[PDB]
Design an enzyme around this catalytic site. Structure first.
Site, mmCIF file in Angstrom:
data_model
loop_
_atom_site.group_PDB
_atom_site.id
_atom_site.type_symbol
_atom_site.label_atom_id
_atom_site.label_comp_id
_atom_site.label_asym_id
_atom_site.label_seq_id
_atom_site.Cartn_x
_atom_site.Cartn_y
_atom_site.Cartn_z
ATOM 1 N N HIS A 45 0.820 -1.203 0.000
ATOM 2 C CA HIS A 45 0.000 0.000 0.000
ATOM 3 C C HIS A 45 0.863 1.267 0.000
ATOM 4 C CE1 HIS A 45 0.183 -0.167 4.567
ATOM 5 N NE2 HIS A 45 0.318 1.132 4.355
ATOM 6 N N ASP A 89 -0.229 -7.706 1.613
ATOM 7 C CA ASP A 89 0.288 -6.348 1.647
ATOM 8 C C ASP A 89 1.809 -6.379 1.853
ATOM 9 O OD1 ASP A 89 0.355 -3.565 1.701
ATOM 10 O OD2 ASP A 89 -0.539 -3.391 3.725
ATOM 11 N N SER A 182 3.769 2.379 8.638
ATOM 12 C CA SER A 182 3.562 1.398 7.579
ATOM 13 C C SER A 182 4.886 0.907 7.000
ATOM 14 C CB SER A 182 2.725 1.966 6.452
ATOM 15 O OG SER A 182 1.403 2.251 6.870
HETATM 16 C C1 LIG Z 1 1.288 6.028 -1.355
HETATM 17 C C2 LIG Z 1 0.058 5.762 -0.624
HETATM 18 O O1 LIG Z 1 0.332 5.763 0.821
HETATM 19 C C3 LIG Z 1 -0.751 5.867 1.611
HETATM 20 O O2 LIG Z 1 -1.881 5.961 1.200
HETATM 21 N N1 LIG Z 1 -0.422 5.862 2.925
HETATM 22 C C4 LIG Z 1 0.955 5.750 3.393
HETATM 23 C C5 LIG Z 1 -1.450 5.968 3.954
HETATM 24 C C6 LIG Z 1 -1.691 4.713 4.761
HETATM 25 C C7 LIG Z 1 -1.307 4.452 6.060
HETATM 26 C C8 LIG Z 1 -0.484 5.295 6.946
HETATM 27 O O3 LIG Z 1 -0.791 6.550 7.073
HETATM 28 O O4 LIG Z 1 0.515 4.779 7.458
HETATM 29 N N2 LIG Z 1 -1.748 3.178 6.443
HETATM 30 C C9 LIG Z 1 -1.560 2.512 7.741
HETATM 31 C C10 LIG Z 1 -2.639 2.806 8.764
HETATM 32 C C11 LIG Z 1 -3.765 3.523 8.409
HETATM 33 C C12 LIG Z 1 -4.770 3.812 9.325
HETATM 34 C C13 LIG Z 1 -4.677 3.386 10.616
HETATM 35 C C14 LIG Z 1 -3.559 2.632 11.049
HETATM 36 C C15 LIG Z 1 -3.433 2.179 12.388
HETATM 37 C C16 LIG Z 1 -2.344 1.458 12.783
HETATM 38 C C17 LIG Z 1 -1.331 1.150 11.876
HETATM 39 C C18 LIG Z 1 -1.402 1.582 10.579
HETATM 40 C C19 LIG Z 1 -2.516 2.337 10.115
HETATM 41 C C20 LIG Z 1 -2.447 2.634 5.363
HETATM 42 C C21 LIG Z 1 -3.086 1.405 5.241
HETATM 43 C C22 LIG Z 1 -3.720 1.091 4.050
HETATM 44 C C23 LIG Z 1 -3.699 2.017 3.025
HETATM 45 F F1 LIG Z 1 -4.314 1.698 1.851
HETATM 46 C C24 LIG Z 1 -3.083 3.249 3.116
HETATM 47 C C25 LIG Z 1 -2.436 3.565 4.311
#
Ligand SMILES: CCOC(=O)N(C)Cc1c(C(=O)O)n(Cc2cccc3ccccc23)c2ccc(F)cc12
Ligand SMILES: [Zn+2]
Length: 226
Positions: A45, A89, A182
């Site tokens: 992701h 993922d 992430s």
């Molecule tokens: C280039 C695209 O990049 C993005 O879109 N990013 C980096 C945003 C994004 C994040 C993040 O901000 O790290 N997380 C982790 C996450 C999200 C929400 C709650 C969480 C609670 C705990 C751990 C992790 C959690 C995702 C998961 C699925 C997803 F599709 C997108 C994201």
């Protein structure tokens, strides 16, 4: 990282800081870790139009001689990655050149053993992510120790599966990986066993990590052919 401490500078020299570009919005950021001199492992992701990797960092706002800012030539996303369920993922990034080995930068290879890790033990995770729901990404690398939970504790994530994913963080505490963490590694007794994937917007643990044991054949297959 919520509820953690500041890492000893350069004490985790495999840690990678990722800056990811997309065509229609500002940069986003993830973690990762160097498993070969020209390969970083992270979450699928975190994929985008282009990515830059910084190795050798502690405070990401202060440039220093330990920094290596390296170009990515190709992104290898798991072919079965599903953007709805978030199954599979995981992603490998091939670097244009091999990194230099210094005291601040080195690889973290896997042992030959590929055993399934059961619930109960304590492990550690690190990253530059937000330190609270209404807080910004940390300037310094942070880390926290967390408990591996029974899979029932993640039941409310309706697409969670025990044989693909780890369930990480006691729900009675605030400690957790969060947004910005992430793609970072979960280490159990010095061995990487998980990758930060997703959780709740309100930061209530546990969170979901990719289970590395299950993908070891795919990783070997990419590295051998490239
Ligand atoms: C280039 C695209 O990049 C993005 O879109 N990013 C980096 C945003 C994004 C994040 C993040 O901000 O790290 N997380 C982790 C996450 C999200 C929400 C709650 C969480 C609670 C705990 C751990 C992790 C959690 C995702 C998961 C699925 C997803 F599709 C997108 C994201
Ligand atoms: Zn330094």
């Amino acid at each position: 990282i919520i509820g953690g401490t500041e890492s000893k500078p350069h004490s985790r020299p495999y840690m990678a800081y990722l800056e990811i570009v997309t065509s229609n919005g500002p940069s986003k950021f993830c973690g990762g870790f160097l498993i070969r001199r020209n390969f970083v492992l992270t979450a699928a992701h975190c994929a985008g139009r282009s990515i830059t990797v910084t190795l050798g960092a502690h405070n990401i706002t202060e440039e220093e001689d330990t920094w290596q800012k390296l170009e990515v030539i190709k992104q290898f996303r798991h072919p079965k990655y599903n953007t709805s369920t978030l199954h599979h993922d995981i992603m490998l990034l091939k670097l244009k050149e091999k990194a230099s080995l210094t005291l601040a930068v080195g690889t973290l290879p896997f042992p030959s053993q590929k055993n399934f890790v059961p619930p109960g033990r304590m492990c550690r995770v690190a990253g530059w992510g937000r330190t609270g729901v209404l807080k910004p990404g940390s300037d310094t690398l942070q880390e926290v120790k967390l408990r591996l939970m029974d899979p029932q504790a993640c039941s409310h994530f309706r697409d969670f599966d025990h044989n693909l994913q780890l369930c990480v963080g006691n729900p009675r505490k605030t400690k957790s990986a969060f947004k910005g963490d992430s793609g970072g590694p979960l280490l159990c007794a010095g061995v990487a066993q998980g990758i930060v994937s997703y959780g709740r917007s309100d930061a209530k643990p546990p969170a979901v990590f990719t289970r590395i044991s299950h993908y070891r054949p795919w990783i070997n297959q990419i590295l051998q052919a490239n």
